């Protein structure tokens, strides 16, 4: 697999997602760029359909980790590169604890020049009084680390994260994910060993943008596997 040689450079990305969270449906569109040499990503967010539903922070997670830079001892268990760009699915259930929960999945892969993250999200049984669908969530993002472990039985990986928003009172609203990947393709991939993944987040807006938005930037580095005598 020479997936990886079509990360060498900047690649524009597209995003699009269609959103139902408790009858609330909604449509995001997302644009800019990945640059995985330096593992960053840069992209503005439009809800399409008007106001968005759920706080901007709880869609982070779900609107491309192929854009990860691995280091040089690691590059053998970059699975999301290995795949393309024949793609792989990713699946998640995020659970907030004491409200709702997402349920999404999504396509990762090349259409042309750019890459593609096409998602699918269903929400449910969320308290319409809540912190998700009340927006009492602050607009930032904490950094964090995404465990990963390889699922040999499917041909892919797993991963459990504890995402932790800020919640406008102080407290902190807990958003437990579980996600699995699986490749469209039947390519070789790459399963890797158990290691994370570190990321980092900023959120802001842009000044002349009327419409429902968020400006993201980025940065995901792979890390945990132990460098030694090569």
């Known amino acids: 697999s020479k997936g990886e040689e079509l990360f060498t450079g900047v690649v524009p990305i597209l995003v699009e997602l269609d959103g139902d969270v408790n009858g609330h449906k909604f449509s995001v569109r997302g644009e800019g760029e990945g640059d995985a040499t330096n593992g960053k990503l840069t992209l503005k967010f439009i809800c399409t359909t008007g106001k968005l539903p759920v706080p901007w922070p709880t869609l982070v997670t779900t609107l491309v980790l192929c854009f990860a830079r691995y280091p040089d001892h690691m590059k053998q268990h970059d699975f999301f590169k290995s795949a393309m760009p024949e793609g792989y699915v990713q699946e998640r259930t995020i659970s907030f604890k004491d409200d709702g929960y997402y349920k999404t999945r999504a396509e990762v892969k090349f259409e042309g020049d750019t890459l593609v993250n096409r998602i699918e999200l269903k929400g449910i049984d969320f308290k319409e009084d809540g912190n998700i669908l009340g927006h009492k969530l602050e607009y930032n993002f904490n950094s964090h680390n995404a465990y990963i472990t390889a699922d040999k039985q499917k041909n892919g990986i797993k991963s459990n994260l504890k995402i932790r928003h800020n919640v406008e009172d102080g ?11 699986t490749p469209i393709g039947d390519g070789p991939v ?39 005598m090569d």
């Not at 407290?171 to 990947?181: E, F, G, I, K, P």
């Not at 987040?201 to 460098?227: C, Q, W, Y």
């Open 171 to 181: 407290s902190v609203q807990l958003a437990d994910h579980y996600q699995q990947n």
């Open 190 to 228: 790459l399963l890797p060993d158990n290691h994370y993944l570190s990321t980092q987040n900023a959120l802001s807006k842009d000044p002349n943008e009327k419409r429902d938005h968020m400006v993201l930037l980025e940065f995901v580095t792979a890390a945990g596997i132990t460098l030694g």
